[PDB]
Amino acid sequence: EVKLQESGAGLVQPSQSLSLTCSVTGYSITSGYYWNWIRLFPGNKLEWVGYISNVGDNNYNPSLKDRLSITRDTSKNQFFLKLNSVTTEDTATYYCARSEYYSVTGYAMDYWGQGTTVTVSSAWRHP
Amino acid sequence: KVEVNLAAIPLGKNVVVKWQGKPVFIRHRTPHEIQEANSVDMSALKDPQTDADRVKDPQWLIMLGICTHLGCVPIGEAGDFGGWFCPCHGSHYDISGRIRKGPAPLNLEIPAYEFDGDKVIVG
Amino acid sequence: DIELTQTPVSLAASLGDRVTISCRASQDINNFLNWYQQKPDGTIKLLIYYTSRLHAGVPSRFSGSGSGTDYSLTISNLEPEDIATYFCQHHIKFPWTFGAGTKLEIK
Numbered sequence: 001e002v003k004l005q006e007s008g009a010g011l012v013q014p015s016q017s018l019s020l021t022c023s024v025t026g027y028s029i030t031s032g033y034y035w036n037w038i039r040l041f042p043g044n045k046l047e048w049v050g051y052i053s054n055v056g057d058n059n060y061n062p063s064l065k066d067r068l069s070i071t072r073d074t075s076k077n078q079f080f081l082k083l084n085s086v087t088t089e090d091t092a093t094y095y096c097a098r099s100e101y102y103s104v105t106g107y108a109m110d111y112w113g114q115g116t117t118v119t120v121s122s123a124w125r126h127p
Numbered sequence: 128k129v130e131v132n133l134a135a136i137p138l139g140k141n142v143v144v145k146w147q148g149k150p151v152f153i154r155h156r157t158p159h160e161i162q163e164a165n166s167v168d169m170s171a172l173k174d175p176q177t178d179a180d181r182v183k184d185p186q187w188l189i190m191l192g193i194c195t196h197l198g199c200v201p202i203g204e205a206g207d208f209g210g211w212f213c214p215c216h217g218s219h220y221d222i223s224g225r226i227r228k229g230p231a232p233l234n235l236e237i238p239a240y241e242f243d244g245d246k247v248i249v250g
Numbered sequence: 251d252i253e254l255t256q257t258p259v260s261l262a263a264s265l266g267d268r269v270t271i272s273c274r275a276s277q278d279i280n281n282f283l284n285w286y287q288q289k290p291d292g293t294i295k296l297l298i299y300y301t302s303r304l305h306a307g308v309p310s311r312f313s314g315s316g317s318g319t320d321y322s323l324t325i326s327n328l329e330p331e332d333i334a335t336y337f338c339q340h341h342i343k344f345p346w347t348f349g350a351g352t353k354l355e356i357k
């Protein structure tokens with residue numbers, strides 16, 4: 001069985017960089033399919049952020065393409081999201097998920113992460 | 128060039144049809160099997176292939192039922208990996224028909240095929 | 251960019267009866283339409299892919315039909331944990347886009 005565990009800062013200050021890590025166990029990132037990142041806004045509107053393939057190719061949503069950076073670390077088996085210069089806009093619960101791809105049925109996200117809720121607040125938080 | 132009517136094949140059943148004197152295995156896979164097939168790490172395979180590298184439509188497993196070791200025909204729904212077992216020298220294949228244990232060096236070969244509605248055309 | 255419209259928007263029903271949600275896209279998508287289930291606790295799961303194919307674990311009471319630009323998601327009975335938010339995406343071209351959402355409540 002495949003498992004995705006998400007972790008990272010659940011609160012960042014505007015103008016800074018949001019960094020989320022998605023740990024995968026029970027299947028290597030380099031072994032196959034696509035590794036995605038998506039966010040769920042409070043107004044209930046899921047948005048596809050982007051992905052990194054098993055080869056290392058990126059594919060980002062043109063809406064955020066100039067800010068994000070989805071990298072990985074084969075050694076520890078985990079991929080990351082890095083959304084630069086955040087705003088109150090970027091306040092959403094982020095999800096990392098795997099999507100398969102069959103030439104007939106197309107893509108489909110079959111394995112989802114727990115979900116990490118991030119808030120872009122000016123507040124202070126103990127690191 | 129053989130035409131098989133997929134609409135005739137039930138849920139989790141195996142059908143064997145002749146093509147150029149060689150047996151062609153066709154399984155209408157269940158949702159659970161499809162997951163079992165696409166959730167295996169390459170590190171556990173002597174012949175590394177994703178289930179997608181082997182099938183066009185995850186519902187239809189279409190392969191040559193010729194053991195890659197010495198040519199016997201593997202037995203369906205047998206073995207230690209939920210797929211096929213070759214009685215000749217004990218090769219076990221998984222639900223994607225990949226070699227998991229035994230002397231066979233390769234996964235069951237996939238012949239060329241195209242879909243056309245309720246029927247597939249192997250050849 | 252394509253965009254889906256999930257209607258009805260957050261409609262409720264009884265303790266065990268059929269319900270039909272839909273997803274209409276701006277452009278034309280072959281049948282590349284998936285459906286996701288977001289549990290109240292935040293757990294999101296895949297339910298249907300390629301407009302009608304069921305995923306592993308999803309009960310038989312779930313259907314899926316449609317084509318071209320109009321789609322569906324029928325249920326047999328909401329007995330007892332079918333209460334969640336259902337989404338729908340397309341994947342004929344990047345970027346993938348989801349629907350507005352559809353909450354399922356019990357009166």
Ligand code: FES
Nearest residue numbers: 194196197213216
């Ligand atoms: S021929 Fe199948 S194991 Fe030898």
